[PDB]
Design a protein around this motif. Structure first.
Motif, PDB file in Angstrom:
ATOM      1  N   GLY A 120       0.812  -1.201   0.000  1.00 47.24           N
ATOM      2  CA  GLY A 120       0.000   0.000   0.000  1.00 47.24           C
ATOM      3  C   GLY A 120       0.847   1.254   0.000  1.00 47.24           C
ATOM      4  N   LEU A 121       1.970   1.229   0.724  1.00 40.82           N
ATOM      5  CA  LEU A 121       2.845   2.395   0.807  1.00 40.82           C
ATOM      6  C   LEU A 121       3.297   2.824  -0.578  1.00 40.82           C
ATOM      7  CD1 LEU A 121       5.303   1.516   3.683  1.00 40.82           C
ATOM      8  CD2 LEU A 121       3.610   3.342   3.773  1.00 40.82           C
ATOM      9  N   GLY A 122       3.229   4.124  -0.834  1.00 35.69           N
ATOM     10  CA  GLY A 122       3.703   4.673  -2.084  1.00 35.69           C
ATOM     11  C   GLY A 122       2.780   4.501  -3.268  1.00 35.69           C
ATOM     12  N   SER A 123       1.623   3.861  -3.087  1.00 33.60           N
ATOM     13  CA  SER A 123       0.709   3.547  -4.178  1.00 33.60           C
ATOM     14  C   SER A 123      -0.581   4.342  -4.046  1.00 33.60           C
ATOM     15  CB  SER A 123       0.346   2.054  -4.192  1.00 33.60           C
ATOM     16  OG  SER A 123      -0.595   1.778  -3.174  1.00 33.60           O
ATOM     17  N   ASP A 124      -1.389   4.269  -5.098  1.00 34.16           N
ATOM     18  CA  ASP A 124      -2.683   4.939  -5.072  1.00 34.16           C
ATOM     19  C   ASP A 124      -3.708   4.230  -4.200  1.00 34.16           C
ATOM     20  OD1 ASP A 124      -2.494   7.427  -6.176  1.00 34.16           O
ATOM     21  OD2 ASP A 124      -2.758   6.721  -8.249  1.00 34.16           O
ATOM     22  N   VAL A 125      -3.347   3.117  -3.557  1.00 35.42           N
ATOM     23  CA  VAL A 125      -4.194   2.627  -2.477  1.00 35.42           C
ATOM     24  C   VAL A 125      -4.469   3.741  -1.469  1.00 35.42           C
ATOM     25  CG1 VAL A 125      -4.404   0.944  -0.626  1.00 35.42           C
ATOM     26  CG2 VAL A 125      -3.475   0.257  -2.843  1.00 35.42           C
ATOM     27  N   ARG A 126      -3.462   4.585  -1.194  1.00 35.20           N
ATOM     28  CA  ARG A 126      -3.653   5.701  -0.267  1.00 35.20           C
ATOM     29  C   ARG A 126      -4.782   6.617  -0.718  1.00 35.20           C
ATOM     30  NH1 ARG A 126       0.321   6.582   3.309  1.00 35.20           N
ATOM     31  NH2 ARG A 126      -1.455   7.479   4.452  1.00 35.20           N
ATOM     32  N   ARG A 127      -4.852   6.894  -2.006  1.00 35.74           N
ATOM     33  CA  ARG A 127      -5.885   7.793  -2.547  1.00 35.74           C
ATOM     34  C   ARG A 127      -7.257   7.164  -2.629  1.00 35.74           C
ATOM     35  NH1 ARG A 127      -6.912  10.865  -6.263  1.00 35.74           N
ATOM     36  NH2 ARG A 127      -5.967  10.209  -8.235  1.00 35.74           N
ATOM     37  N   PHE A 128      -7.328   5.867  -2.895  1.00 37.76           N
ATOM     38  CA  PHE A 128      -8.621   5.191  -2.845  1.00 37.76           C
ATOM     39  C   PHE A 128      -9.270   5.350  -1.474  1.00 37.76           C
ATOM     40  CE2 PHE A 128      -7.214   2.398  -6.475  1.00 37.76           C
ATOM     41  CZ  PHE A 128      -8.305   2.646  -7.304  1.00 37.76           C
ATOM     42  N   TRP A 129      -8.468   5.320  -0.408  1.00 36.85           N
ATOM     43  CA  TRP A 129      -8.992   5.298   0.952  1.00 36.85           C
ATOM     44  C   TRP A 129      -8.984   6.649   1.638  1.00 36.85           C
ATOM     45  CZ3 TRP A 129      -9.670   0.795   4.380  1.00 36.85           C
ATOM     46  CH2 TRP A 129      -9.564  -0.428   3.706  1.00 36.85           C
ATOM     47  N   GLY A 130      -8.096   7.561   1.238  1.00 38.93           N
ATOM     48  CA  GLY A 130      -7.953   8.798   1.989  1.00 38.93           C
ATOM     49  C   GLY A 130      -7.715   8.546   3.466  1.00 38.93           C
ATOM     50  N   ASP A 131      -8.411   9.317   4.311  1.00 39.51           N
ATOM     51  CA  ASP A 131      -8.176   9.262   5.751  1.00 39.51           C
ATOM     52  C   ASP A 131      -8.726   7.999   6.404  1.00 39.51           C
ATOM     53  OD1 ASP A 131      -6.970  10.569   8.070  1.00 39.51           O
ATOM     54  OD2 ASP A 131      -9.028  10.884   8.783  1.00 39.51           O
ATOM     55  N   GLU A 132      -9.434   7.146   5.664  1.00 37.93           N
ATOM     56  CA  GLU A 132      -9.826   5.847   6.200  1.00 37.93           C
ATOM     57  C   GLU A 132      -8.631   4.909   6.352  1.00 37.93           C
ATOM     58  OE1 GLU A 132     -13.245   4.044   4.221  1.00 37.93           O
ATOM     59  OE2 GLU A 132     -12.985   2.190   5.377  1.00 37.93           O
ATOM     60  N   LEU A 133      -7.525   5.180   5.655  1.00 41.08           N
ATOM     61  CA  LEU A 133      -6.313   4.367   5.729  1.00 41.08           C
ATOM     62  C   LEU A 133      -5.194   5.250   6.259  1.00 41.08           C
ATOM     63  CD1 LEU A 133      -5.207   1.521   5.112  1.00 41.08           C
ATOM     64  CD2 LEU A 133      -4.446   2.438   2.910  1.00 41.08           C
ATOM     65  N   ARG A 134      -4.738   4.954   7.473  1.00 38.02           N
ATOM     66  CA  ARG A 134      -3.694   5.704   8.153  1.00 38.02           C
ATOM     67  C   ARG A 134      -2.445   4.844   8.298  1.00 38.02           C
ATOM     68  NH1 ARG A 134      -7.907   8.248  12.742  1.00 38.02           N
ATOM     69  NH2 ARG A 134      -8.869   9.704  11.257  1.00 38.02           N
ATOM     70  N   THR A 135      -1.339   5.490   8.662  1.00 35.27           N
ATOM     71  CA  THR A 135      -0.097   4.779   8.920  1.00 35.27           C
ATOM     72  C   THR A 135       0.100   4.569  10.415  1.00 35.27           C
ATOM     73  OG1 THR A 135       1.191   6.829   8.943  1.00 35.27           O
ATOM     74  CG2 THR A 135       0.976   5.666   6.841  1.00 35.27           C
ATOM     75  N   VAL A 136       1.079   3.731  10.737  1.00 33.19           N
ATOM     76  CA  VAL A 136       1.498   3.510  12.114  1.00 33.19           C
ATOM     77  C   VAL A 136       3.016   3.427  12.119  1.00 33.19           C
ATOM     78  CG1 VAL A 136       1.211   1.002  11.886  1.00 33.19           C
ATOM     79  CG2 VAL A 136       1.257   2.056  14.170  1.00 33.19           C
ATOM     80  N   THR A 137       3.642   4.089  13.086  1.00 36.23           N
ATOM     81  CA  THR A 137       5.094   4.085  13.207  1.00 36.23           C
ATOM     82  C   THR A 137       5.551   3.082  14.260  1.00 36.23           C
ATOM     83  OG1 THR A 137       5.223   6.368  12.485  1.00 36.23           O
ATOM     84  CG2 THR A 137       7.096   5.514  13.714  1.00 36.23           C
ATOM     85  N   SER A 138       6.581   2.315  13.924  1.00 33.44           N
ATOM     86  CA  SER A 138       7.143   1.362  14.867  1.00 33.44           C
ATOM     87  C   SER A 138       7.668   2.076  16.106  1.00 33.44           C
ATOM     88  CB  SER A 138       8.305   0.623  14.224  1.00 33.44           C
ATOM     89  OG  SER A 138       8.887  -0.267  15.160  1.00 33.44           O
TER      90      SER A 138
END
Ligand SMILES: C[C@@H]1CCC(O)=C(C(=O)SCCNC(=O)CCNC(=O)[C@H](O)C(C)(C)COP(=O)(O)OP(=O)(O)OC[C@H]2O[C@@H](n3cnc4c(N)ncnc43)[C@H](O)[C@@H]2OP(=O)(O)O)[C@@]12CCC(=O)O2
Ligand SMILES: C[C@@H]1CCC(O)=C(C(=O)SCCNC(=O)CCNC(=O)[C@H](O)C(C)(C)COP(=O)(O)OP(=O)(O)OC[C@H]2O[C@@H](n3cnc4c(N)ncnc43)[C@H](O)[C@@H]2OP(=O)(O)O)[C@@]12CCC(=O)O2
Lengths: 295, 248, 248, 295
Positions: free
Chosen positions: A126-144
């Protein structure tokens, strides 16, 4: 003193579903889809669905009836030519469905998170791809919370749990309590769909007693136990026209007819009249007649 | 030896896997499939290959044939392989840009496309986890465009060097009916490594929307060895299915 | 009907699972095992039970016997069941405190114990994910202590109400050779629900380091039904293995 | 043109290990442990190990030789009486090892994180328990970027990846390339140990050709593929004295002798002299003689 008898009809099972539900559909592409349960959905008035699936003609048929509002999927494929499902394509080009398209591995991940009652699982896909744009703020990141050796902390996709109101899956063999098995080379993810859902319906080619089930397949093929199933439907040929492991292959000629029938309003009314306007038995009889005619 | 365009494409697809070692080769089209199997029968015997469904092959079979198996690779396990990094996929592409962004999802706006394809499939996971290469059977300016409509395969201009989550990205080759390319040009731009015999620089330039780095100096694709020609013509693809997938 | 202390303990262990429904019963000692199987043969037929190794039983067998199976439950799948919450475990305990913290790991300092046991095993995962009960065959003040040395099973004073990650914690019963207890006293304190016939309040008080809530008013454990006695004595435990695990 | 021949001896495999390594050991408790590989470790000078294991007599034997500096484990058990491993107990009560004791499910989780090259995976197990104190700041939490429906965000254990320098596992059958299978009711986690490690050594009861392997067991039992193994050791009875699926059960009488021999310096020197001072063949001969004597 007996375990619960979970045997129900196709229409009974769909009678437990409600408009607006999030429903996961098992199988994969044009492979071991619960097509009899999907046809029962089409006969019903259940609509406004959010569908989670590795999509194939299950999603196409639901789109043909306007039953899909939102779809979470890793792909949509018929697996054979023409490859793209024409009813999914029509819903997409008409803007009729909101999509949360995602990498195929994210589906598995989200179902695993739901199965474990976790709010997310981290994943690189998902990182770096338009998966991020399909989801917008429904898909967030998490930092180790642990940096790597170099001192840099990884930030990954937080795949949210794909919690489901219901799951519909089709398997090769099962008992009246929901113990169930696949035969063939791949379980797909049907165990995960059941584990991620509140209400779980499994259609099977044949219902047998428990002792017959466990003597027919190896232990490892017993992918559903009684805690994973709420209703059991006996539906011979219930994956048609998708393949079904050892039971049968894909009805390639009929899938081609389904796809070509979607091209015009005229071709589709006729397909509906012949195949989708009666019972499962009526469908099965018409499919048998088609095979005889096209030899 | 008269060598056809498809035969040059087959050896170029084998060369994708040069030095790959003991990893899963996952070609997703006929020419890359012949190439991966050709590599396995020549200089990369430790490659793992599957039947494209769920079985890992022990021996290397002809296109469309079965072979004795050595293991199990259902879809749920494929995701484990992807995440492990021990894989090199060869995908097709509806669009590829100058930095290697790739689209096999759809054309047009994300929520209302003008044409629907597969959706992203495994392309995001592939491109973020392990070596990824591309095969294009008809090299045109519609495929090799300035901007892809939907980024299903991650290109070099998406990489955050501060986030080690991106550290496994590597786009190795693009093989087309015109030549062999990589993203080793300046700023990770599409770069010509070789042109197949009979292909001219202007043929490539006229069929690529952007400038191809090193195009003027790119040499010709190597000849197949006698053994490679025997393996392609007699063992792997005796029916010449490769020709159907390679355009002029 | 003369009923032995172990027979009262067996029905109390069955009562642990009253209302459990279609979940995995995981007793980890002989008395809870007889109890879970007794419940399955009477009022909880939908319980899932295993052979303690990897097989899910269809029928309910006697202690130590095989039975026809209905499914597969290797250790990796047990962790999936734990995380799903669809389970009720009955663990033993070297120590249990007034709020239900439990120790089966070791005695003494964490990095240099004075006595080593199993380590925490699955106790942390059990207590944070799903109903957990305890069995104690010899109820003493060394078991029921003010402070456990190592918290392997999570008690009520560890819960953060602001963090929904804790929302599945539930310690259901403690059954001992003296009676039936829960953590329903004020502030989730150890509370007497019943004392087995012949056990006095002072016997419990003298063998518990802390005050037992409701001890003065606790009634006597119910009688087994005729059917329960038949199932215990004839079907589930004809060799009276239960007696070896229940102390005076 | 051939795939790599990975066959090596027990001593060869240990010759690839180095003092200071983090090593994962497969099996579970007193079940399918790579005991022949552990005995080869004892013969070697490899020490100062960090061990990741579902512990049993493997960890006990390593402790008897002072080879363990740090241990990550979900438990240590002999599975039968006296249940606790006496050599692990002695190392613990003497403060000879630093422990990162954890919930048993956290081991699986940490190995899964390493297998996926992820820095952590979230898990509920551990919260509220003294697992936190065993680890201190080596074990941190992670908060969900998605609140639950109520508006509260879950904070979970961030189980760090259990990355391994090496894995030692024992399986029932395998080929010279590392394809390998278990027989019996449980794979344990040996695939995860291999997937989490840099160098992977599998001992097997018997080495067979690939085609014999795949015709002997179902697909689902083929838990190692060639990308998961670096060396293959043929070690018949190589799990003794632990059980080994369909091949044999636990040697209960001998395990009792091992445990009772740990009680005094005198009993242990004799056990070492008889069982641990020669080759694997010498061990196997002495174990056979013990069984005959104790009938
Ligand atoms: C589980 C694993 C995980 C790991 C892994 O790895 C996986 C992968 O899956 S890895 C991905 C593998 N899959 C691929 O790699 C497939 C790539 N695809 C192909 O290879 C195609 O076959 C093709 C690209 C060669 C041809 O595609 P195509 O036929 O659709 O289009 P094309 O021929 O270019 O003609 C284009 C037509 O559109 C028209 N048009 C062009 N612009 C537009 C526009 N703006 N608007 C409207 N129309 C347009 C044009 O006029 C043509 O119409 P027309 O002809 O004029 O009518 C898995 C397996 C399954 C999964 O999920 O994960
Ligand atoms: C995978 C799944 C996941 C899900 C799941 O659920 C799992 C579980 O596993 S779930 C947990 C199940 N497991 C249990 O529930 C076991 C509980 N344990 C028992 O049931 C014991 O059998 C017992 C408690 C009844 C007796 O224990 P014990 O024999 O050690 O001690 P005890 O008899 O009290 O005498 C005490 C002796 O110490 C002495 N002493 C007392 N103080 C001290 C002190 N300060 N210092 C020094 N000594 C001391 C005292 O003088 C006595 O010495 P002595 O007699 O004087 O010499 C799994 C399976 C495997 C896994 O990992 O996950």
């Amino acid at each position: 003193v007996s375990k619960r008898d979970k045997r129900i009809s196709l229409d009974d099972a769909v009678g437990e579903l409600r408009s607006g539900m999030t429903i996961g559909i098992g199988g994969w592409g044009s492979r071991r889809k619960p097509m009899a349960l999907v046809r029962a959905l089409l006969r019903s008035d259940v609509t406004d669905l959010t569908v989670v699936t590795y999509g194939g003609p299950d999603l196409g048929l639901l789109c043909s009836a306007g039953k899909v509002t939102k779809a979470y999927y890793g792909f949509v494929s018929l697996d054979s030519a023409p490859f793209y499902d024409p009813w999914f394509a029509k819903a997409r080009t008409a803007g009729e469905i909101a999509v949360r398209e995602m990498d195929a591995g994210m589906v598995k991940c989200g179902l695993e998170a739901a199965a474990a009652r976790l709010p997310f699982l981290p994943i690189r896909a998902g990182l770096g791809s338009d998966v991020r744009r399909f989801w917008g703020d429904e898909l967030r990141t998490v930092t180790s919370p642990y940096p790597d050796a170099s001192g840099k902390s990884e930030t990954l996709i937080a795949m949210p749990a794909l919690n489901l109101d219901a799951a519909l899956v089709h398997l090769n063999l099962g008992d009246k309590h929901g113990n169930a098995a696949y035969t063939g080379v791949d379980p797909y993810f049907d165990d995960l769909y059941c584990a991620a859902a509140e209400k779980r319906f499994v259609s099977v080619e044949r219902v047998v007693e428990t002792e017959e089930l466990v003597k027919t397949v190896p232990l490892q093929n017993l992918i559903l136990n009684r805690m994973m199933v709420d209703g059991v439907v006996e539906a011979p040929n219930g994956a048609h026209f998708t393949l079904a492991g050892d039971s049968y292959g894909r009805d390639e000629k009929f899938q081609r007819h389904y796809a070509e029938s979607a091209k015009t309003p005229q071709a589709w009314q006729q397909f509906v009249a012949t195949y989708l306007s009666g019972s499962e038995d009526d469908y099965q009889a018409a499919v048998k007649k088609f095979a005889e005619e096209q030899a | 030896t008269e060598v056809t365009r498809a035969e040059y494409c087959a050896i170029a697809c084998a060369d994708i896997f040069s030095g790959a070692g003991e990893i899963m080769a996952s070609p997703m089209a006929t020419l890359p499939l012949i190439g991966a199997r050709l590599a396995r029968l020549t200089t990369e015997p430790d490659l793992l290959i599957t039947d494209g469904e769920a079985l890992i092959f022990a021996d290397t079979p002809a296109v469309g044939a079965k072979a004795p198996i050595e293991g199990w690779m259902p879809f749920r396990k494929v995701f484990d392989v992807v995440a492990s990094g021990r894989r090199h996929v060869v995908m097709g592409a509806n669009q590829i840009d100058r930095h290697g962004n790739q689209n096999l999802s759809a054309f047009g706006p994300l929520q209302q496309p003008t044409r629907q394809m597969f959706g992203v499939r495994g392309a995001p996971g592939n491109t973020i986890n392990h070596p990824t290469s591309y095969w294009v059977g008809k090299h045109t300016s519609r495929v090799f465009c300035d901007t892809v409509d939907i980024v299903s395969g991650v290109g070099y201009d998406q990489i955050d060097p501060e986030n080690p989550a991106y550290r496994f990205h590597h786009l190795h080759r693009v093989v087309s009916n015109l030549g062999v390319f990589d993203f080793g040009g300046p700023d990770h731009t599409f770069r010509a490594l070789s042109l197949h015999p009979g292909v001219t620089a202007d043929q490539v330039a006229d069929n690529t929307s952007f400038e191809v780095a090193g195009l003027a100096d790119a040499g010709v694709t190597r000849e197949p060895t006698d053994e490679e020609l025997r393996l392609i013509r007699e063992v792997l693809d005796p029916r010449s299915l490769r020709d159907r997938e390679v355009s002029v």
